[PDB]
Design a protein around this ligand. Sequence first.
Ligand SMILES: OC[C@H]1O[C@H](O[C@H]2O[C@H](CO)[C@@H](O)[C@H](O)[C@H]2O)[C@H](O)[C@@H](O)[C@@H]1O
Ligand SMILES: OC[C@H]1O[C@H](O[C@H]2O[C@H](CO)[C@@H](O)[C@H](O)[C@H]2O)[C@H](O)[C@@H](O)[C@@H]1O
Ligand SMILES: [Mg+2]
Ligand SMILES: [Mg+2]
Ligand SMILES: [Mg+2]
Ligand SMILES: [Mg+2]
Ligand SMILES: [Mg+2]
Ligand SMILES: [Mg+2]
Ligand SMILES: [Mg+2]
Ligand SMILES: [Mg+2]
Ligand SMILES: [Mg+2]
Ligand SMILES: [Mg+2]
Ligand SMILES: [Mg+2]
Ligand SMILES: [Mg+2]
Ligand SMILES: [Mg+2]
Ligand SMILES: [Mg+2]
Ligand SMILES: [Mg+2]
Ligand SMILES: [Mg+2]
Ligand SMILES: [Mg+2]
Ligand SMILES: [Mg+2]
Lengths: 454, 459
Amino acid sequence: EIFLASKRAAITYNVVAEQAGVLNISWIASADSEDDRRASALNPDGVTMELHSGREILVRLIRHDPAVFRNVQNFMTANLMWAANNYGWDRWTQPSFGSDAREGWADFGRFTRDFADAILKSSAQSADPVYLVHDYQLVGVPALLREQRPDAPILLFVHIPWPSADYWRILPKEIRTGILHGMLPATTIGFFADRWCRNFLESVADLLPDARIDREAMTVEWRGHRTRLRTMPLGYSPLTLDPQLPEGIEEWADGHRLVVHSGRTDPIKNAERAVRAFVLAARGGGLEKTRMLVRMNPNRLYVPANADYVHRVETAVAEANAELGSDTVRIDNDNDVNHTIACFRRADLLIFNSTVDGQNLSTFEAPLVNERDADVILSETCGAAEVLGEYCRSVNPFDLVEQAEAISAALAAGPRQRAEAAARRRDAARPWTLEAWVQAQLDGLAADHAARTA
Amino acid sequence: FTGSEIFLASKRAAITYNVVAEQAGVLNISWIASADSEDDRRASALNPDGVTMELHSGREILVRLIRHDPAVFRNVQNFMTANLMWAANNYGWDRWTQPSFGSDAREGWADFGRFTRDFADAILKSSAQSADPVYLVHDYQLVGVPALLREQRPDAPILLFVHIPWPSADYWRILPKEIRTGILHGMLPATTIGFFADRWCRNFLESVADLLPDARIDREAMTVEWRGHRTRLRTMPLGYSPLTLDGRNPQLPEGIEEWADGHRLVVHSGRTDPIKNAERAVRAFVLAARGGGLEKTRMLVRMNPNRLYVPANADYVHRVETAVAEANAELGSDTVRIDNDNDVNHTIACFRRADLLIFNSTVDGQNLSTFEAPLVNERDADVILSETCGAAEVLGEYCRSVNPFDLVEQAEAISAALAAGPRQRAEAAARRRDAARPWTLEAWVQAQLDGLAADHAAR
Ligand SMILES: OC[C@H]1O[C@H](O[C@H]2O[C@H](CO)[C@@H](O)[C@H](O)[C@H]2O)[C@H](O)[C@@H](O)[C@@H]1O
Ligand SMILES: OC[C@H]1O[C@H](O[C@H]2O[C@H](CO)[C@@H](O)[C@H](O)[C@H]2O)[C@H](O)[C@@H](O)[C@@H]1O
Ligand SMILES: [Mg+2]
Ligand SMILES: [Mg+2]
Ligand SMILES: [Mg+2]
Ligand SMILES: [Mg+2]
Ligand SMILES: [Mg+2]
Ligand SMILES: [Mg+2]
Ligand SMILES: [Mg+2]
Ligand SMILES: [Mg+2]
Ligand SMILES: [Mg+2]
Ligand SMILES: [Mg+2]
Ligand SMILES: [Mg+2]
Ligand SMILES: [Mg+2]
Ligand SMILES: [Mg+2]
Ligand SMILES: [Mg+2]
Ligand SMILES: [Mg+2]
Ligand SMILES: [Mg+2]
Ligand SMILES: [Mg+2]
Ligand SMILES: [Mg+2]
């Protein structure tokens, strides 16, 4: 009786996919490629997939209008909404919204309707449907489901940050209020971090004059709807972690301590500042036997900011080597999860210094697989820092001096200090499994639902 | 405050041989400010007690200039206060690419601690032969001063009044740890902290709650309790100084009256500062005009040069020039003009002539022009006002309140303002003047005194 939906499914012929497997339910997601459109058309029952975890799932892909989907993905969600929720605008010079934003918003409504139709069509014969709506791209869905199913439990879980009210307000009026209107009819809105729940509540208080927020209870009362905000942290999926280095890396790292920065090709991952911080720390000859690997996993390169970030990182690494000597810093840029885990295991120092991050799962996974008791530098603005920051070197991701000094201190630490820190850090990470988080969703929603309906 | 001597301090005294200057005039008290130059130091040495200065408003004040170490000051001014600190509180960083703080930021903090001890020392020396001093400390360069005054004058009323925004907690947190905490430690010992807008007070309380684990905030009482100090946050709006708006009819700058002659005139006016948002103003104008529709309309971008040595400000001027060049290329030659000077007679004259006034700041501590301009305007000009100006909390309901980042919204507001008839414009402008008129400098000074006295009484 549980229905699960999220936009992104990268199929070839994922946390939401693992959750589908845990609950043994179908997963409604978007067809993006032509192959998905064909597979979906040819397979009305859904497409079956085995995940690495060994879980096997059924995925129902929605065939959107291709132009609507193109605009929504490339412009609205991955670019505009991304910069709105992940703090990428300077205000002085960007953004400047024109007609494109309005057409994007209309297209967004159409995409939203596609998901609501799929979810309602699929649940139509269900007497007591439970709706789990995942991701920021589906923020419009709860209002549509609520209109048809006034009594259904609806969780909206957002995997990315929620920005401060002043920053949320950057968006065009129809969009900044329209998104909030779409979300509040949910029974429960979930984020990974208290800071995001707080920012959400402030955004609502600021923009919606009829809303009453309660900061202590973390609730909104708005036009009938009572909505509860919950923080439900996620760390890792053990079954997905249950590898070998990329080519050249083991021999290149052989006689050295290895610093690893790892993340998507997304500006929030902050590899440019990580490299510049390493350079400050290595500035001759502050460090001698150390190399740095920048592991990048290509993702949404249809966004200009993402392409431009890659170039900025490449430029920084070349400048690093020009300074520190040839082959001090390398980039390895592929989407092999096996390579990522291998890099995690080999690291002497792990850097997850994001400008901001909804959670950051790498900061749980990496210490859990690392067999060198690697120290971890973690940005204070990652959702993960609310659970793990006391066990890592928590840093301001904009301060190169602070980061360089953390790098230097981490590499100076002996194996006995590193052993003890790493043990505490693993102990803190270990409870935050995918299975526990799924349970947290259902438990939170069940509790809130009784009050929501009342 | 019977029996009290009041002391007023602020950094900026652009004296060549200002709101704080007018306040010194209102209260008949000396103004302690920074010697920027060699001339300033000489004048201050020659006149230990102070230099007499007539303001154009007609008031006469005594100004006492503090000699700083020349290098300390140039760095505090050029890098810290004109540039780094400005971007922090006026929202000029994208986070993805800027800022990246290096060793210069830590040295800058150290220099800032010096400039701060300079002011606190001078203030305390000046008040040393006073039994019951009252300290009015103005604007963001002096954020460190209240802690030092409190340390040496535990029972003195201290107001710190910040003229610029206070940013959201997440944004304030961009700053290096020593600075983001250090500045809060500096401010909280004040009896009262004032801002021009409620939003700034709210953001300040959030920053304190976020960074200072020892502090307790009350969002409704607007208070902080931290390590002993109870601090009250107050919103004290300021609009205009009537003594700068009376007197003879001002004259327009060279050629403007001719050029604007047969046309409706859109005026954007402001300092050469990215927050003033002229580039978007011009692009919104172009969207509203093209192609036909605003045929008898011209646009004047009045810029007042200030801090052009800051790269962000130089870049802004370049972007505006570029947008004006592109506007003219599109709409026809000489449709949009830039006119730059710091002539206040020219500014008032342009306010007077405007058919449409645009004050569309990306953010603004208050913006006083949005009060002055409707008060002197002779044409019932409409006002487009950014919702992110502190002024909008008082005047937003009486103007066309816009999201300053939305070109479509702004173009539609330009079109709607110019489509309005004389009776609608007359009625709107009368309500707008009525809403603006009470917010005088004199009333704001009284608000400072009244708030401080009340908060001090709650010792
Ligand atoms: O499509 C947006 C991103 O979704 C994922 O990342 C978000 O959700 C993660 C947990 O599922 C968080 O750790 C992270 O902070 C969020 O950005 C996905 O991992 C990314 O590849 C996507 O860009
Ligand atoms: O030195 C910073 C600026 O100070 C003034 O502007 C601030 O204070 C004004 C009121 O005194 C507000 O209207 C404005 O929003 C603030 O930015 C001064 O007018 C500016 O020239 C200075 O750059
Ligand atoms: Mg997307
Ligand atoms: Mg992007
Ligand atoms: Mg808001
Ligand atoms: Mg609600
Ligand atoms: Mg990543
Ligand atoms: Mg991304
Ligand atoms: Mg991105
Ligand atoms: Mg950098
Ligand atoms: Mg930290
Ligand atoms: Mg001077
Ligand atoms: Mg200054
Ligand atoms: Mg500052
Ligand atoms: Mg400051
Ligand atoms: Mg510091
Ligand atoms: Mg504290
Ligand atoms: Mg006056
Ligand atoms: Mg006169
Ligand atoms: Mg008090």
